[PDB]
Structures are given as structure tokens and as C-alpha cells.
């Protein structure tokens, strides 16, 4: 995030880190329940990757986190790489996440919900702070 | 490595698809929603993450980091996957499996 600010530790409990086996974060994600994570289709997540929950400081390792394995990947069949439309993939965890104050689910809207322009929303992640 | 060790957060406004089309034009489809162009931006490593707005005191997933400027321009709107348009596919996947 360019021009972001450090978040309070544990304040966005559904935020996950998608990493390879070796520990490299490539994309973020969100827990929607204890066995499902939603992320982008362009991320190219596979069953050899890991979902790290309860994470805050990636340079630390005193924080207790959960490294969950993926049992199955559900890429949206109508995803077009040309346009990047329908960019969503569901991750079916093989090992369920244990919820607490630092790990919990985010709500999903209903197909009819409308969020007006000018509405202040929030975005989170561990992406570049400058390019 | 302009990658922050600690989790970042940024507050930004939702754009109307039309105002967003003043930048991206043809690019903007219906399963997409814009936000930003207010001095903040999502950059590489942010993809797949949440764009959440309050709805009755509960944070709700309105978007998923998708794409935007190639250099992460904070004055250009970022494009997210519009969740309300994709939430039925999710319900069917969840229910089915």
C-alpha cells in the first residue's frame, strides 16, 4: 500500500497471507468462515501454497500464527485473463482455522446491497509501500 | 524491497463506475468497482486482499484487490473485483462443496 499506515495488531482478523512453501508472500486474502478463503483469480494459488492466518509483523516470529494447507482451489470459471474480469478464487482449506480475536471472518454482502460513491472504505495488505 | 514488515491499511472512497471510466474507459466491466485516486493506492503484494466498508457496524467485503496503474499511481483509481456481482457464485460453491 502506497501511503498507508501501520495497522493495530489484530484489528483486521480476516486478513491472510498467501505464501509459497518456502515462506514468500505473493498475495493477500480474506477468511469468510473457518474453512474458506476468498482471493484473486490472477494470484494463481495452488495446493502447494499456504494460508498464514493471525499474522502481523512478517519480520517477527513470536506472534502465534496458523499455517493452513489448501485442499482445493476454485477459480471462477468465467475469469478472463485478457480483461481481468471475474477475478475471484475460493480456497478450500484442508485444515480449518481456529477463530479468536486475531483470527475471524469478514462479512459478505448480498447481491442486492449497494455501496454508494464517496463512501469511505478500507483496504489492507503487505504490498509495496513504493514503486 | 519496498515491502513493509507490518500490516498496512489505507482509507479511500468508492468511485462511481462512470467517474472511474474517465480513467480506464473501456477497461471497466460490471464485475469491477473502483476506489482510490485520493493519494493512496494498492501496489504489488496487495492482490487478493480486502476492500471493506461498514454495514451496520460489521465490516463487509465490497471488493478484492485486482489491478490498477502499473506504477501504483496514488492519483489513479484502483480496480477491485466487485463482490456483490460475484457473491452468488460463492454461495453456490460454498453450498455445493
Amino acid at each position: 500500500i502506497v501511503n498507508g499506515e501501520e495497522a493495530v495488531p489484530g484489528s483486521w482478523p480476516w486478513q491472510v497471507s498467501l505464501q509459497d512453501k518456502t515462506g514468500f508472500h505473493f498475495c493477500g486474502g480474506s477468511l469468510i468462515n473457518e474453512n474458506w478463503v476468498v482471493t484473486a483469480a490472477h494470484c494463481g494459488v495452488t495446493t502447494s501454497d499456504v494460508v498464514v492466518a493471525g499474522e502481523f509483523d512478517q519480520g517477527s516470529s513470536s506472534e502465534k500464527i496458523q499455517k493452513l494447507k489448501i485442499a482445493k482451489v476454485f477459480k471462477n470459471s468465467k475469469y478472463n485473463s485478457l480483461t481481468i474480469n471475474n477475478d475471484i478464487t475460493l480456497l478450500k482449506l484442508s485444515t480449518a482455522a481456529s477463530f479468536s480475536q486475531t483470527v475471524s471472518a469478514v462479512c459478505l454482502p448480498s447481491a442486492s446491497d449497494d455501496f454508494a460513491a464517496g463512501t469511505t472504505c478500507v483496504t489492507t495488505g503487505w504490498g509495496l509501500t513504493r514503486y | 524491497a519496498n515491502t513493509p514488515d507490518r500490516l498496512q491499511q489505507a482509507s479511500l472512497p468508492l468511485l462511481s463506475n462512470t467517474n472511474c471510466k474517465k480513467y480506464w474507459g473501456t477497461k471497466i466491466k460490471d464485475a469491477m468497482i473502483c476506489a482510490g485516486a485520493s493519494g493512496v493506492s494498492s501496489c504489488m503484494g496487495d492482490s487478493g486482499g480486502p476492500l471493506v466498508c461498514k454495514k451496520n457496524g460489521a465490516w463487509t467485503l465490497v471488493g478484492i484487490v485486482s489491478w490498477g496503474s502499473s506504477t501504483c499511481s496514488t492519483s489513479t483509481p484502483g480496480v477491485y473485483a466487485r463482490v456483490t456481482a460475484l457473491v452468488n457464485w460463492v454461495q453456490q460453491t460454498l453450498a455445493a462443496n
Binding site: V8, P13, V122 | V52, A58
Partner: peptide, 10 residues
């Protein structure tokens, strides 16, 4: 869902 136990400071 959507109610963090630790509230965010924005």
C-alpha cells in the same frame, strides 16, 4: 462476522 475483537484505529 465483521466485528473485530481488537478495534481498528483508522
Amino acid at each position: 462476522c465483521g466485528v473485530p475483537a481488537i478495534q481498528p484505529v483508522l
